[PDB]
Write a protein that binds this DNA or RNA. Structure first.
Ligand SMILES: Nc1ncnc2c1ncn2[C@@H]1O[C@H](CO)[C@H]2OP(=O)(O)O[C@H]21
Ligand SMILES: Nc1ncnc2c1ncn2[C@@H]1O[C@H](CO)[C@H]2OP(=O)(O)O[C@H]21
Lengths: 170, 170
DNA sequence: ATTA
DNA sequence: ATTT
């Protein structure tokens, strides 16, 4: 009755081509999947919406993209996934990289440098270190890379069963 | 050596055509003027910078443009002038309207209704009440109107004398 | 409406 | 390059 899978993604980059091609496919395997479309902004961290599904979910599946470093809601929300993970390691994380290399995620260089070049003029001098030391550890787990050739269809089918297999076999 | 005039204007609307046309002319009347160029943002209200120049000035001249209520910094900056005025009524205000009618600013209608249509989704429901009641009072005092035809070179000189006349005679 |  |  509660949520079992919680997603997360960029705003406009991958909201209507691959993320959607997954959520529909997942519902055809009978598992209630939670994704949110309201941009929040009504504060700094809303209550019984995001913060509800975070502690209720089971298998966090963050979909890092190429511009995932700009929207200040995304990072400081991901800093809550990996922080809640280190408390109880019973739940897992299955990142799915996208277009970008799996080397510009462990050092925030390359396509992210312009992002943290302007985020350092507004926020604290230590909060930024709280994002990087949390964004880095995500780039060390397992994950399906998707180059410019891989057919963005079977990857969805191959990655749905790997999420359903942790439900039937328990 | 302290400030005697403090301005405030919309950003990319009236920064490089009329305000600078006026700021130089004031500098040829030997009166030290203060305008700020950095976008600030670094916090909620900077300490010994903007909030210092308010108490040091003497003749506030807020230049209400056409979309002066969209930039979230401007309003809560202007709400600071009219409050400092009522506590120690030694200083004055000489607003200079621009494009906008003086009847679409005493009721927030028209080109401003679109601005206050979305601020109810982001900020607190009471802070808006204090701006709506502070933006109205400014639109009651004196003020040179400048339509679409008035020679903006003539009003600059005419508005220079009215500022200097309040200094020599003490 | 959107920018966001 | 802003800017939420
Ligand atoms: N303007 C927005 N820009 C970028 N991401 C957004 C925006 N609004 C919502 N999201 C994302 O919806 C997701 C629901 O869990 C959540 O994941 P996120 O990456 O923290 O960023 C949010
Ligand atoms: N990007 C900007 N957006 C809106 N207002 C700006 C911007 N940059 C400067 N200002 C305004 O410069 C003024 C300095 O006294 C200050 O008054 P303001 O009305 O708070 O709006 C500022």
């Amino acid at each position: 009755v509660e949520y079992d899978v919680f997603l997360s993604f960029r705003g406009p980059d991958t909201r209507k081509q691959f993320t959607d091609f997954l959520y529909h496919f997942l519902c055809y395997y009978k598992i209630h999947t939670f994704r949110d479309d309201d941009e929040l902004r009504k504060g700094k961290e809303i209550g019984p919406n995001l913060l509800r599904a975070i502690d209720q979910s089971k298998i966090y599946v963050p979909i890092i993209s190429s511009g995932y470093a700009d929207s200040k809601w995304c990072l400081m929300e991901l800093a809550e996934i990996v922080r809640r993970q280190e408390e109880d390691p019973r739940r897992i994380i299955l990142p799915i990289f996208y277009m970008v290399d799996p080397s510009d995620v462990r050092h925030q260089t390359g396509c992210y440098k312009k992002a943290f070049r302007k985020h350092a003029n507004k926020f604290d001098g230590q909060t930024i270190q709280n994002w990087k030391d949390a964004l880095k550890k995500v780039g060390d787990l397992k994950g399906w890379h998707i180059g410019k050739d891989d057919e963005q269809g079977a990857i969805a089918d191959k990655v749905s069963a790997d999420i359903w297999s942790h439900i039937s076999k328990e």
